């Protein structure tokens, strides 16, 4: 019983964290086998940040200009190259702590765990969702860049995010592990704005299933609805439209609770139209949207 915003255990990722310094700039890097991945903006100065040319800046560097440290110990950089918005540094020794891993690009609405690091050292771990506008509502101070987001299945780490930037609204932007940004953001310090965000409807329904599974039931009702009727309402409240594919995904939780997906949709429809009126669901007074269906199934088995 109980339902918590749960992150994956972070150990397998902790053993990959290192520190990358260029002149007066230090960030985190990810050390797998003999490569260290970090954000390319590690090579920028104060002046270079309004409008950097990373090709120019990179060509002016040698292997020797990168200080890489695993803990207190310096790793010799024997190679460097740029892959999109990431720097790749070859080092002359392999990380024995390297887990089974892969790089994946996730879709908006999916969740992952973030290991917040500073100076190559883990600070905390928290779970979050990739917003529909490609930002993350993270907790990141100066020097957190290079921190990674990941999921774990069996013993395999799927790296999906590396932190690069904070936007003026205070939400966060980064890339996958090929250095491609999520969203239309660039690694330069110009005013950039996030698209208007929206509520991840699929996850809200999953979380209402989690509520039901843990005895929170007051919001249910006798009604049912159609996909189109539901969408016409949710869209008025800035909820993502729900598709048949999304309905299908909710199947297992539907079966487990004996509540039809469209019956759960009608419940949500009334909640949006009438509010919650003092009441809470799983302790919250607003509808949570940072749990996927798979998350709910995993935690509530």
């Amino acid at each position: 019983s109980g339902f918590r915003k749960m992150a994956f255990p972070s150990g397998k990722v902790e053993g990959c964290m290192v520190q990358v310094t260029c002149g007066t700039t230090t960030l985190n890097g990810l050390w797998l086998d003999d490569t260290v991945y970090c954000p390319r903006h590690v090579i920028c100065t104060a002046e270079d940040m309004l409008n950097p040319n990373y090709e120019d800046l990179l060509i002016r560097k040698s292997n020797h200009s990168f200080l890489v440290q695993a803990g207190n110990v310096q790793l010799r950089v024997i190679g460097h190259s740029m892959q999109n918005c990431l720097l790749r540094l070859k080092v002359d020794t392999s990380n024995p702590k390297t887990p089974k891993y892969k790089f994946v690009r996730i879709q908006p609405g999916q969740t992952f765990s973030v290991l917040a690091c500073y100076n190559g050292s883990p600070s905390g771990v928290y779970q979050c969702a990739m917003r529909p506008n490609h930002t993350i509502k993270g907790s990141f101070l100066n020097g957190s860049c290079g921190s990674v987001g990941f999921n774990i299945d069996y013993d395999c780490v799927s790296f999906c995010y590396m932190h690069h930037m904070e936007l003026p609204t205070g939400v966060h932007a980064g890339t996958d592990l090929e250095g491609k940004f999520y969203g239309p953001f660039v690694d330069r310090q110009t005013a950039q704005a996030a698209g208007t965000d929206t509520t991840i409807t699929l996850n809200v329904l999953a979380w209402l299933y989690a509520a039901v599974i843990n005895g929170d039931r007051w919001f249910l009702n006798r009604f049912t609805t159609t996909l189109n009727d539901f969408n016409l309402v949710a869209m008025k409240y800035n909820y993502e439209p729900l598709t048949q594919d999304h309905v299908d995904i909710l199947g297992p939780l539907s079966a487990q609770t004996g509540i039809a997906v469209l019956d759960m949709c009608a419940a949500l429809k009334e909640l949006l139209q009438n509010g919650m009126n003092g009441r809470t669901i799983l302790g919250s007074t607003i509808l949570e949207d940072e749990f996927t269906p798979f998350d709910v199934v995993r935690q509530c088995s």
Binding site: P39, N142, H164, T190, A191
Partner: peptide, 4 residues
């Protein structure tokens, strides 16, 4: 945006 601030490079973090």
């Amino acid at each position: 945006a601030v490079l973090x």
